[PDB]
Paper text:
Haloarchaeal pleomorphic viruses (HRPVs) infect archaeal hosts living in hypersaline environments. The virions contain two major protein species, a spike protein (VP4 and VP4-like proteins) protruding from the membrane surface and a smaller membrane associated protein (VP3 and VP3-like proteins) residing mostly inside the virion. Here we describe crystallographic structures of VP4-like spike proteins from two pleolipoviruses, HRPV-2 and HRPV-6, showing that these proteins have a unique fold, different from class I–III fusion proteins. VP5 is thus a bona fide fusion protein.
Residue numbers in the entry: 1 to 498
Amino acid sequence: IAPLVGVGLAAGAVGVGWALREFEIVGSDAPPEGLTADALKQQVYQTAKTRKSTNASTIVDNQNILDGVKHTAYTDAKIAAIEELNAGSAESAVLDAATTEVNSYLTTVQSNFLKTWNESVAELDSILSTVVNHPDIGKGDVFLMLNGSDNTIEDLLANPSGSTDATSFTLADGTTMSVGTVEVDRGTESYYYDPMSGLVGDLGDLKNGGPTVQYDGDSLVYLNASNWKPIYDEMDTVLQNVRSGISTWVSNVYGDVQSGEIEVSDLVTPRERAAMMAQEEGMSQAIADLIALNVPVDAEREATITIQDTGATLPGTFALTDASDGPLESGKTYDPSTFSGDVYFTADMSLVEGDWTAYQSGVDGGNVTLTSEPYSGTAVELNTAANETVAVDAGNWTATGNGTWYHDVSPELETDITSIESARFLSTAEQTQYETIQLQGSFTIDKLTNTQTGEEVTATSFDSSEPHTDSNYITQEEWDQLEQQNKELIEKYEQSQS
Ligand SMILES: *[C@@H]1O[C@H](CO)[C@@H](O)[C@H](O)[C@H]1NC(C)=O
Ligand SMILES: [Cl-]
Ligand SMILES: [Cl-]
Ligand SMILES: [Cl-]
Ligand SMILES: [Cl-]
């Protein structure tokens, strides 16, 4: 089965909780030993494809949410600085309390980011163990093993956190963390890759940066330090800018802002609210986390989109990392690849629709054939020439090695021998499946509707709270507005999702 988000919507899953709190990382799932030659090659490819997808869903595809990390860091730093200020502490103590909150929060962000990389290197190490141990296969049968010069590398190794060849990274907290490395053996010399160092930069590096996993003519690159280095550098820029900025903020506020002027002890931070929602059941977490990361959102305008490449229709709300790409308009086609920022879409996956054209017209004795893989959590509803409608779930379609999907529909049919005139796909799910996806492929807004008034509007309006700076959030009004804008955005999504 093909993933609905990945293929059907030409999108990516969104997990941004790692930038807000301690996040649950997807554990290593390396193929077992004792497998057949083909199955190991297949499972190594599947293990790398799933790892690339989960690393993209959380870290790699969301590099533009770090502006929200900067905003979140400032909220906690300023609150702690205001507490010490209201208590009549020395400027030193006010700044120390602020910096500790910056360092404590950014350690949780750095740790989540490096644990995601560590789990990938650890899983790679157990892949390379299973590959070497397999009697019929070597590393070159599953990996490209080429460098920039298109020459075969001496060896591809993975040193998990704790290993002698794993790097030691100092967190904002001042504590040390071991980070796993992707090793390229060059004899006596060796290349080590981690999110901090990235690639070496010469032709001795892996042809495509990270290991290239190949199986049955299809291949993929993952664990590419070139994709992790810009995220680390921007995260490191944020840590340095918030530290220097809060030192400036404290100097501008100390003496000027009097004790009792600002009262933010009773205030529940957007980060805290999203952490609380993560502990319970309710609205979809990625949008709760995206609101907490102060990403411009249009909660009030429901848009029905058509993913151009597949024809999949989906109703939902938009979120833009950079509202400069916006305002998105009704009837217009948008290419997210031309956008300066990233496009997010919160929708009920149970409402995914779309015309299915990847089918064979001839029904050979009840056996209906599909020329493309059906999507996960969906069912292909076929309309026969004798006006008979039958829906078959994705898991009930049987695959052949020649890229076709068959299912015996003779028990549900009266006229087994017929021709399929029409076909469409719809969700299998009975309950709501609200989720946030990142739009990668082109899409057209077929309609825009204001959810409160119920009217058909022509443009979108993105809302976010004022971002933090070294001179702002020095008044009660500013802090009360932050609290209120967050509360009304959460309530808006909580109302729409029930
Ligand atoms: C497939 O068919 C079974 C009956 O054999 C049905 O109960 C189930 O809902 C279907 N779902 C999948 C994904 O196989
Ligand atoms: Cl490789
Ligand atoms: Cl990756
Ligand atoms: Cl790099
Ligand atoms: Cl979600």
